[model samples]
Target: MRIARLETFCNEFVGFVRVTTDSGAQGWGQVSTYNADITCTIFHRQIAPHALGTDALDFADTLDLIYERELKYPGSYLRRAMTGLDTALWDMRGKLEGKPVATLLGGSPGPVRAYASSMRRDITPEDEAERFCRLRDDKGFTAFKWRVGAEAGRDHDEWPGRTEAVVPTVSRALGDGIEKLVDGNSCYSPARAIEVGKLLQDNGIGHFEEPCPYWEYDQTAAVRAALLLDVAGGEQDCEYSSWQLMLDRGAVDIVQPDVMYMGGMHRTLQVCQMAARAGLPVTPHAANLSLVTMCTMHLLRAIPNAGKYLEFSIEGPEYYPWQEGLFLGDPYRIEGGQAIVTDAPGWGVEISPTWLDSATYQVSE
Candidate 1:
């Protein structure tokens, strides 16, 4: 698809950017936005018109010009639009150039290693342990993330206490070989994070993330001050200024950037460059193996600050809209605790309208 129309859907929360070029090459891209409806609204009505005809390869500059072309609605909307639009163009360009987006984006230095992000599975310890065991045996993912809060009580909901008991519990469940991590989802205060950090430290957890609400670098630093576990954030943050603040203050031990919010893959590379200078690793927080995940694979392989573990999920169900054609499961293989991407064009997802038909489409016009 060159550049046709953009659409958004709220039911499944998807933003589609349809691309078509002079040669009639066509492709559709799904926006990885948290607010897909809003993302679609801005992209189709505003950004697409401004970018009706342009070199698809000049993606970052196209985004920059769109923001500057309209002074009134500068950064956020245009950036959001560019986030999806850029991915779509990359998909389009991949088809045109006969290369995967990863190959075009400087090629991969090596394969990406990932951990399955374990959220909403912590309702019961058995549920959490079972998930980890399954990952070890079936997927061979060496790393895992789990949600933590004082059992949703609101006050101590994020406090350390016995929740730290999960450190040993999960460790014993996973043995010493598996790497474990936790995310409080920004539920804790500085004091609470400190307490929990100490608890997790005693249990051999490798990383701690979003213990306190994002933007509290000082509070984040305060938590890391006494604890041995590494502190991580930036998944919720999209601003470059905020990224600089986190790096400058030594507030975070690891950097997690959501490429969707960070605007584009090129921008994400800028962040990884910063992390490289700081001697910290960059791990993206993406849920599925869509553009974001594929972009992340390219990014992790290209950058020096890439993390050791990549997050991948393969929980297939009968109701899942995507079938074998969406991905043959060859490109992103999880064999022996490693994620290897195939040499396929454009992140290895051969798009099919059939897959789209099964999914609930939200925006058409």
Candidate 2:
């Protein structure tokens, strides 16, 4: 089947891409969040022309060509736009094969462990602890990740003593036998990250994400070497060359690739394979309820070098208005601290028509 048409729905925050084949098969995909309008323009202008009339199953060459042709502009926007097309094609492939994306990827409907990920830094340690404990008790979440330092703070905390204080507060509240992950969000220097990493090691925290500036390879590797806990980063990186440098230099104990940020499953799988060869586990960064998480779930179940749990975002509509009510039903419910993948063909969830209708829509032949 050949791609016949490509369309996008954008509200300037959240975006969705719809792919249609000549034979009338339809598939849905999501562009990475924030800057949907910009990505939507790139989708139609730079990405869609190469996708139309292309073989649905044999688009490796098409993807490579897009990457090669767009060499001048190598960054998140092109990858984000490419993700819309790549994920939609996977959905189309799954529908055509009478199977779910997971099954097509060499797995089946199954439960993948989840970790409650906090997206707020403004909240107090006590408030963060209270909500996390509630989820731990009520939803059986054994793993929880909370923010530590300011995002891109350049060695400054979110507040005076918030980072140092939140560490022990949440760790104490959650108690023993629970996996605690913390994201610094590229906030610390190598010296500061190592300092913080020591604190985490003292409190039994096992995962330290983006401890140093994400792009500073030597700095991150220094922090990784200094810490007993696993150092995770690479979510901000999308290029394969960057990944090669990150992996080859042993920059992180755990490699975190965002499916949408790195383009899509195809590129992500390549990252995973690279990680596998290096004896590292891939804990993908899917810090939202978008199709990125769903795609991560499927990718995790199939990959041999998968991480312990999905990075399930815990913020509600208030913090992430873009992620609110995009699906027809709640396809992302957590039970027993695990998300059960659906057996329905493709991504196995229906997009809300209301979102589609309300969005600024565009189609290209």
Candidate 3:
């Protein structure tokens, strides 16, 4: 069926995309978060023209065409805009096949493990440890990731000693049973990253993410070479050429491709395929309660080199107010340290009607 229309709805922080086919079938997808309204505007401006009147099931070819046609507009904006349409096409395909996206992608419906991910920097070590512990006791999270250093910290912590303090404090609080992961957010130089990587190693932390500037593949590779623990990055990377360089250089032990940031599952899957060949694992980057995490769950189930757990953001409404009221049911609920994937057609989740009612709407036909 040919796509007849594409529409977007946004309330600032979060945005949703809808694609309608000539046959009158429709599917929904999400633009990558933060400044999503701009992404929505770009979607209609650049992506919709090609999307409309094209074969809805021709997503594979269409996606390549999008990249080729939008050669001048390379980078996040174009890819972010394409994600909404790409994901919506996947949803349409799932609905058409009468199967869940995972099942269609060669993965059986199942529960996947999740790592409670924290998006905080101001919280003290005591407070951070206390809250993570509380979640561990209350919910059944067996794995956890906490922040370290400022994003692109230039070899400094968010605070004077937040990084030094949070590492051992949070690790010791959670103890040995739970998996400990830390993100530098591209905040360190090779020397400083290795210093912190050793600190994480001493504390029994197994996963260290983005320790050095993500673009400096050699810098991250140097840290990876020094550390015994797994060094991870690529969350900010959007291009296939970047992934090729990172993987080829052995820059990181784990490959983290954000579903929304890398366009969608199809593109992220390509990253996963490349990682598998190099014998590296694909953990993915889904640090929110949006459709990104839901989509990651489905993609992880099918990839051969899937990571041990999903990156389930543990922040509340205080930090991510935009994530509020996005889903109808608690699709991301943790049970025994895992997220259960719904086998319903498409993404198996519904957008909140109230949200759409309040959001600014625009359409292209």
Candidate 4:
């Protein structure tokens, strides 16, 4: 069956993609990136005209052509918009080949290990520690991450302020043995990063993510020299050259490429392989649970320097509930601060048309 029609579904928050085949078979996909209009329009105006009559199974060529053609229109939503379509294409291919997309993508490396990277500005440090412990040690996660942004909003904070204090709070809360890391989200400078890096390192924190502005690659390398801590960055990078520069300059200790923002899996794979060659590790950003997560898992499975912990949002849809029917018999058994992956096909869980249709509004052709 060939792609017969493409349409959009919208809610106030989530977006949905409806793809139909000539044989009346259909599949749906979504990335939950919160861009219903442009995401839908990206498929309609740019990707749809190109996708029609093309073999839906040939996603590689489809993705290649998108890169080849849609460069000018490549906004931040490039991957988020395309992810919905990508998942639909995979589902359609699975329907056509009578094989799951995971098999097509090469079966997963069993279940992926999960690290709870929980960050909330709303909560107090005490609450951050309390809840993080509940989510990390009690519920069972291998490692955990929390935000480390400057306490005084964007302004740099000296000692005896919100920024200076959170690291100790995170370290004290997690105690020892629970691998912990903090993210500045690019709120500090190189000097401030060095300060926080020393503080976190003394307390046994695992890594520092995006200590300074993502653009401050050289500054990050300078900060790296001040402490034994491993630095992680690259979540917001938009282009290939930026990632290349970050890796080449030894700017970051661990590369955190957001699949949706890094363009796509091919580009992300480039960064992961580079990190592997450089003896660095890659633990990509976590946001959506569908296509982005699937891509992250596949990358981790395929790469040697995939890092010790894979970042996963602790709070997905309450129905998903960390582990459920979604994970395909989660045999990994989250325990002692680690989560293991399971043997499953195509993201290990299929998002239902009903879920997306009910969650959003559908417009069919």
Q: What is the TM-score of each candidate against the true structure?
A: 0.85, 0.98, 0.98, 0.83
Candidate 2 colliding pairs? none
Per-model tally of clashing residue pairs: 20, 0, 1, 7
249-285 per-residue lDDT for model 1 (tens digits): 7888889987777777777878888888889898777
Whole-structure CA lDDT of model 1: 0.68
Report lDDT (Cα) of residue 98, candidate 2: 78
> Per-residue lDDT for 1-365 in model 3, tens only?
89998889986677898888998898889989888999999998888987788889867788888788888987898888888998888887888887788998899779999999999888899999999999998888999999999998798788898888899999989986889999999999999888889899999999999998899999999999999999998998889999999998899999999999898888888999899899999999998898999999999878778988999999998889889889898888888888977888988889999999999999999
**Higher-scoring candidate on TM-score, 1 or 4:** 1
User: Candidate 2 — which residues are off by over 4 angstroms?
Assistant: none
Could you say which candidate leads in lDDT? Answer: 2
Would you give me the overall lDDT of model 2? 0.91
Local distance difference test, each candidate? 0.68, 0.91, 0.89, 0.66
Which is the better candidate, 2 or 4, if ranked by TM-score?
Answer: 2
lDDT, model 2, position 324: 82
Per-residue error (Å), model 1, residue 68: 3.1
The C-alpha stretches of model 1 lying farther than 4 A from their native spots are 1-11, 69-80, 150-155, 158-162, 313-333, 358-365
Which 10 consecutive residues of model 1 have the lowest summed lDDT? 315-324
